[PDB]
Amino acid sequence: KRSRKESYSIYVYKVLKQVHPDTGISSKAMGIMNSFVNDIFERIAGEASRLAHYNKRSTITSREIQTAVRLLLPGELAKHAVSEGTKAVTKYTSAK
Amino acid sequence: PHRYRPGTVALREIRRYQKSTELLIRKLPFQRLVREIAQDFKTDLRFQSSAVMALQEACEAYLVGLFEDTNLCAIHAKRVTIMPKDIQLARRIRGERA
Amino acid sequence: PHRYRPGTVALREIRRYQKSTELLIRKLPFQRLVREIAQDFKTDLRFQSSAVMALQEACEAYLVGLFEDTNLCAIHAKRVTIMPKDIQLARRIRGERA
Amino acid sequence: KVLRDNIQGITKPAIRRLARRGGVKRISGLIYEETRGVLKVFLENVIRDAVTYTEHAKRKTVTAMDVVYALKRQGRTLYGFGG
Amino acid sequence: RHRKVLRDNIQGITKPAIRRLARRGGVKRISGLIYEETRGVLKVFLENVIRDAVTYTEHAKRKTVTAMDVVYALKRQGRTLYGFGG
Amino acid sequence: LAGNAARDNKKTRIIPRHLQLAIRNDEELNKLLGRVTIAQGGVLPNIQAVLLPK
DNA sequence: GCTTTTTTTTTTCACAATCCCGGTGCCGAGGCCGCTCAATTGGTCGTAGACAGCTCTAGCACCGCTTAAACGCACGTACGGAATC
DNA sequence: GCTTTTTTTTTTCACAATCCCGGTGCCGAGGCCGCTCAATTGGTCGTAGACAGCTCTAGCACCGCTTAAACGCACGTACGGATTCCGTACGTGCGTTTAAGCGGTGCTAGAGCTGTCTACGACCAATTGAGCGGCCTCGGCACCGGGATTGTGAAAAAAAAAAGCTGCA
Ligand SMILES: [Ca+2]
Ligand SMILES: [Ca+2]
Ligand SMILES: [Ca+2]
Ligand SMILES: [Ca+2]
Ligand SMILES: [Ca+2]
């Protein structure tokens, strides 16, 4: 019993061990990281939802995400954010 | 020779323009400025005329209202002349500016 | 007989609290306020513990932030002491009160 | 005295400490009431919305989410309580 | 394509016009240093508003910024504008 | 409210300015349309006290 | 407590600016028309959620200690702001 | 140049705060356990949207005259800001008082979870009228000129406040 409430935590931990494999993290800190991921996910999806909606299109595609990201993140961060979202899709396409 | 006291015409201008709603920037200078800035982001762009008018409506309003905030900021420091630092405080408290 | 001059503990207290993260309002009084105010919208309300702490993080955060902006207005009026008219101006400019 | 105006429970010492953390040095006497005013309007606004959430969800227990959702609406997005 | 590169049009925003806007804002007396400072502000407004409109254009593949591009862009900056569609 | 400001301005049809005056002079409507800009609307007659003559 | 000026107040015209009307003319508010495509009708099927019943979570009340914090009061320094230039 | 004051500067001493040593013990990050549902899959079907081709809107350029606005300079007033200076509202630091905080026990409201059943919403196709675009008109309203009214400002002259000037006591 006790509900079953999902969260991005196991992934926040996985990324942490990529960037700093010996540093850990508190529950309040991991609660802020989960608040952070959900916040921006809703930001980027909402701006995609509207993009798509303004252009009479039914599908959010990776292109909507990339236009939403130019709109939401500041210059130098958008740049890496595109660079990584492009590269991840290319790599995914490449595999199968 | 008749001569109006400094402030008496400013005060008239103040009433003249508050009563009205027509745009206060010269429409072509502004249009040239839209186009100039837009080049930075993409070349050989056309603008709908309504898009340019929508931009001069949104601009004038933004400044006209910043000038309100700015005037309070002058008066808050027992002055009557709005100064650069006034705008800058207005914008820093608005959070437009670090 | 050791006596620190006005404002010299202030600065200690600033440095001190800016270094720290802990709620500054006493938790029980705060909570008794949250129930007092909640009544005016619905009777016999229960709160999760974390609901009150979510309310108290949010409050202090706002207050701290407002004080920064207040200080700035007070310094803008070539003063060192914040006063209501500083708060009220920073709120006028935040668009919080008309 | 000591009677049912819980707002006064917000002590001068605690108001001083906030404005410290906010880089304030010298604090007018009139301010601790101004602050008290402002704090209440803040809570009124947030709590009205949070309980509006509560009544919609058909519950008697105000959740931390209800507050989170309220604070988002008020533009005061809060991290680390369920965001 | 038949001449279009632009000049230095920020001085087009004349001292008369900045003075008139200050007047609408109920400002009585204006320092020397306002006018240049104002143009900076105005520029930074326009740069931000057009970048975003220009994005909405580039997405819909157009080469023509619509009023809706500017409208959608303005709502994004929390500067919602009434009377040009949407 | 627009139409009252229309009538008070001595005109038959409502224009932006009437709407604006009607929105800004009405406490609640102005709150609801607080971050909203009405094109060709202008501002309410407001001159700060201390800016006036003695 | 004066005598002698500056400061502040008052009254008298001159002049500009804004205000209000009717006259005039242009164009877009208003509205009618005819055709369209989206709202409506009447039907079917599937499931979202209302509902009763039960589980056990966590919110509340209470109590009794130990301080740390709030409190009130004495004292004076550095501040706000009035006044001048 | 000298001496005599304020002010400024330097030097010395007091005290918080940090960091280095020595330590202990609690509590939750972390990670393993054991079950479960949400991600994955290949299949099938329908239509979103890429594309290419077609129409024709409306956006861009260019001109030349008219005149409103911007421009730049002369002129002086009221503003900004520096300085001074006075009264006290604040900050500091004591001792006394207060209730928050903590840890704990005991009760139950109510949050939430499970299974059942059907009222209500999706979806469909056929039907038709509400609302679209088009297009025509005539009355509101923008613009003008002329006459009435309001308010400003200078100049002349008063009322008063304040300043500089007295002897006395
Ligand atoms: Ca008609
Ligand atoms: Ca150690
Ligand atoms: Ca005083
Ligand atoms: Ca129940
Ligand atoms: Ca029509």
UniProtKB/Swiss-Prot annotation, chain A:
N6-glutaryllysine is found on K5, K14, K17, K79, K87, K91
Residues recorded as bearing N6-(beta-hydroxybutyryl)lysine in the entry: K5, K56, K87, K91
- The stretch of residues making up the signal peptide is none
Q: Which residues carry this modification: Omega-N-methylarginine?
A: R57, R63
**Dimethylated arginine found at:** R50
Name positions with the PTM N6,N6,N6-trimethyllysine: K56
Give residue numbers for the modification (N6-acetyllysine): K56
**PTM N6-methylated lysine: at which residues?**
K87
* Positions of post-translational N6-crotonyllysine modification: K5
Residues annotated as carrying PolyADP-ribosyl glutamic acid in the record are E6
Any idea which residues bear N6-lactoyllysine here?
K14, K56, K79, K87, K91
Oligomer status and interactors: The nucleosome is a histone octamer containing two molecules each of H2A, H2B, H3 and H4 assembled in one H3-H4 heterotetramer and two H2A-H2B heterodimers. The octamer wraps approximately 147 bp of DNA. Heterodimer H2BC11 and H2AZ1 interacts with VPS72 (via N-terminal domain).
Similarity comment: family membership: Belongs to the histone H2B family.
Name listed for the protein in its UniProt record:
Histone H2B type 1-J
Q: Which organism is it from?
A: Homo sapiens (Human)
According to the entry, what is the taxonomic lineage of the organism? Eukaryota, Metazoa, Chordata, Craniata, Vertebrata
Measured against the full-length protein, the chain present covers: 31 to 126 of 126
UniProtKB/Swiss-Prot annotation, chains B, C:
- On this chain, the residues bearing N6-methyllysine are K19, K27, K42, K85
Residue numbers carrying N6-glutaryllysine: K19, K42, K78, K85
The answer to whether the entry has keyword Calcium is no
Residues modified as Phosphoserine are S20, S49
Chief location bin: nucleus
Self-association and partners:
The nucleosome is a histone octamer containing two molecules each of H2A, H2B, H3 and H4 assembled in one H3-H4 heterotetramer and two H2A-H2B heterodimers. The octamer wraps approximately 147 bp of DNA. Interacts with TONSL; CHAF1A; CHAF1B; MCM2 and DNAJC9. Interacts with NASP; NASP is a histone chaperone that stabilizes and maintains a soluble pool of Histone H3-H4 dimers.
Q: Which residues carry this modification: N6,N6,N6-trimethyllysine?
A: K19, K42
GO CC, sorted alphabetically, is: extracellular exosome; extracellular region; membrane; nucleoplasm; nucleosome; nucleus; protein-containing complex
Please give the residue positions where the record annotates the modification N6-acetyllysine: K19, K42, K78, K85
On this chain, the residues bearing N6-(beta-hydroxybutyryl)lysine are K19, K42, K85
Purpose of the protein = Core component of nucleosome. Nucleosomes wrap and compact DNA into chromatin, limiting DNA accessibility to the cellular machineries which require DNA as a template. Histones thereby play a central role in transcription regulation, DNA repair, DNA replication and chromosomal stability. DNA accessibility is regulated via a complex set of post-translational modifications of histones, also called histone code, and nucleosome remodeling.
Q: What family does this belong to?
A: Belongs to the histone H3 family.
Complete protein: which residues are present?
Answer: 39 to 136 of 136
Name of the protein in its database record: Histone H3.1
One GO biological process term: telomere organization
> Where, per the database record, does this protein carry N6-succinyllysine?
K19, K42, K85
UniProtKB/Swiss-Prot annotation, chain D:
Q: Mark the residues carrying the PTM N6-(beta-hydroxybutyryl)lysine.
A: K12, K58, K72
Its subcellular locations are:
Nucleus; Chromosome
Instruction: Tell me the residues on which N6-acetyllysine occurs.
Output: K12, K72
- Tell me where in this chain the PTM N6-succinyllysine is found: K12, K58, K60, K72
Q: According to the UniProt entry, which residues carry N6,N6,N6-trimethyllysine?
A: K1
Where is it chiefly localized?
Answer: nucleus
Task: Describe the task this protein carries out.
Answer: Core component of nucleosome. Nucleosomes wrap and compact DNA into chromatin, limiting DNA accessibility to the cellular machineries which require DNA as a template. Histones thereby play a central role in transcription regulation, DNA repair, DNA replication and chromosomal stability. DNA accessibility is regulated via a complex set of post-translational modifications of histones, also called histone code, and nucleosome remodeling.
Q: What name has this protein been given in UniProt?
A: Histone H4
Q: Which organism is it from?
A: Homo sapiens
* Source taxonomy: Eukaryota, Metazoa, Chordata, Craniata, Vertebrata
Q: Which residues of the full protein are shown?
A: 21 to 103 of 103
UniProtKB/Swiss-Prot annotation, chain F:
Q: Provide the assembly information.
A: The nucleosome is a histone octamer containing two molecules each of H2A, H2B, H3 and H4 assembled in one H3-H4 heterotetramer and two H2A-H2B heterodimers. The octamer wraps approximately 147 bp of DNA.
Q: Which residues of the full protein are shown?
A: 66 to 119 of 130
Explain the post-translational modification: It is involved in the initiation of both imprinted and random X inactivation. Ubiquitinated H2A is enriched in inactive X chromosome chromatin. Ubiquitination of H2A functions downstream of methylation of 'Lys-27' of histone H3 (H3K27me). H2AK119Ub by RNF2/RING2 can also be induced by ultraviolet and may be involved in DNA repair. Glutamine methylation at Gln-40 (H2AQ104me) by FBL is specifically dedicated to polymerase I. It is present at 35S ribosomal DNA locus and impairs binding of the FACT complex.
Q: Which residues form a coiled coil?
A: none
**Modification sites for N6-crotonyllysine:** K54
Compartments in which it is found: Nucleus; Chromosome
Q: Which organism is the protein's source? A: Homo sapiens
Family (UniProt): Belongs to the histone H2A family.
* PTM sites of type N6-glutaryllysine: K31, K54
What's the domain of life for this entry?
Eukaryota
**Lineage of origin:** Eukaryota, Metazoa, Chordata, Craniata, Vertebrata
**Where, per the database record, does this protein carry N6-succinyllysine?**
K31
Q: Which residues carry this modification: N6-(beta-hydroxybutyryl)lysine?
A: K31, K54
Q: Which residues carry this modification: N6-(2-hydroxyisobutyryl)lysine?
A: K10, K11, K31, K54
According to the UniProt entry, which residues carry N5-methylglutamine?
Q40
Q: What is the designated name of this protein?
A: Histone H2A type 1-B/E
